[PDB]
Amino acid sequence: AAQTNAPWGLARISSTSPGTSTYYYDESAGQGSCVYVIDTGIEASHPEFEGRAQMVKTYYYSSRDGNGHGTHCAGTVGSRTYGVAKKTQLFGVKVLDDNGSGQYSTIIAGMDFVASDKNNRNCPKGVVASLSLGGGYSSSVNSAAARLQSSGVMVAVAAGNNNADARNYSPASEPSVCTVGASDRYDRRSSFSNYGSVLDIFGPGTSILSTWIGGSTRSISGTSMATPHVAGLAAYLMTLGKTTAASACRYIADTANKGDLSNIPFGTVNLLAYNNYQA
Template sequence: MLFNLATVGLLPFALGAPLLEQRDGQTIPGKYLVVLKPGSVASRSPGILSNLANGAIANVHQDHTYSVGDFKGFAASLTDVQVEALKADSQVAYLEADGIAHTQVVSKKSTITQADAPWGLGRLSHRSKGTGTYLYDSSAGAGTCTYIIDSGVYAAHPEFEGRALLVKSYTGVNADDNGHGTHVAGTIGSKTFGVAKKTKIYAIKALDSGGSGSWSTIIAAIETVVTDSKSRSCPNGVVINMSLGGSKIQSVNDAVAAAVDEGLFFAVAAGNDGDNFSAYSPASEPKAFAVGASDIKDALAPFSNYGSTLGVIAPGVDVNSTWNDGAFNVISGTSMATPHVVGLAAYILGLSGPIGPAALKTQIQSLSTTGAIKLSTGASRARTPNKLAFNGISS
């Protein structure tokens, strides 16, 4: 549809900031995310609220404020009247209802203490399935930092050899009271179960004991990663794991994109609904790297989301890794596939030295084993790139 510019100019109030709606997500009543236009007066001012809506929200309490590159904004409780006032302010890019993000795990099975490497590591280092030996270069991700936005990490687990640290908690609990984050960390960098056995692990706890957290907290965690990573020694680069998700929410995607623009690589879970991942966040953000899950028989897991622009597929069914009680656990989900890829990203950076996020995505896809995965039926699944993550060691 074409618009006459003169006509558009006569209708300034008809073109206010939109209130974006989530497709099916769980929203938090009265809580909103407000994203500002780059370069606006409010985005440059320490007193954001006093410069918005003619001062109508000056006394509103901000739950979080955000500044990641050009991504500026805040989270707050707002009345309907305040929402309308912000929608009419030309400095506001858009508003969204805050919502809930969840871990992307399918099931929890019995805790085990097996010290053998899981099947996923063997698959990651061989072109053919069925090999239990994990082959890897001795650099093993040295000189890299891995950030995990999740339920925290049990840093005292002997598998981490003192390389894990809980940087910040947004839940009031300075421990992994769920286990999911520790499991993810183990697949990335533990001595037995990890892909990159020398990477340093930094956890941001944004999810509670039930594995859930608000989107506003997730965005705050992303900003923490950007700022904290600048204070660490990571000469070969920084990678980020987000094994969480929910219905598509633009502000989360924009925050991830802004962090990628800062030079950080984000691998994210595609989701566990057996659906097209384009309807989910943060998986749908093009600058992130969405990961689907496969099983030990090289089939795309029935729960795994899919899509024509999926980044890569990795082992995500019956994955053995570290747990928050000092033992181990076997669980499944795209949450488990994603840390295989984040570990692989750290592993590649340990070998090559620092490269940008886009180049790292390309390298992971170029190394991948093509055509190995059974994608099952359905046109959308069939269009999913048939690329299984591979570390290149035995090619």
């Protein structure tokens, strides 16, 4: 299934060469998969989600996304126009208030909630979590993602947007999850994208156009935009049955495009998400 006029990033994870417009993907499109989108929420009413985005927990007075950065990166996972698994099931864990922040204690509990909420859902292909967050280092947040990862969920966390070694920021530092760097449309590492040894894959994260609140769209930039690309790809491949949940970070790493990113510091992987969709 080819998508004309697709975002530069959807197309970039389905091509070996940058600068294309078409997003080629398997007809399945991640159906039977659940991607817990852990952010500022989801505007589950957005027409783009087609009745597949569902708010299941909030840690503030409202389940509403009054920010967008939650509805955006949920739309990058599995919205019909700007998603990677545009048939997946989305679940909104609102651990961030309507302006980005949120305690470390809440983020752990939202992660701890996904590990147990999945045990009463219909996700036969598998359960994924896109973590489009990222504060400073925290062995508690890291433990919370490893515990979430080592429970049956494919955890995808952002390296961070501060152009440094990601190992000083959580849950990016956590080895067992899939820490995601950010790539720009000319196959260069995003100016902000954190680097490091613990990074496991890079995704399209600069000028990422996807859903927004108010039924609109927006092009924003961050590793938290490169994250949901890889989160839906993981679900696109676990629906494809190509890989398993607690094993899906490495398939993307092993099936990635290698040696195509410019400015990857010596020691950081040079891997870009590629869905291998041979038409």
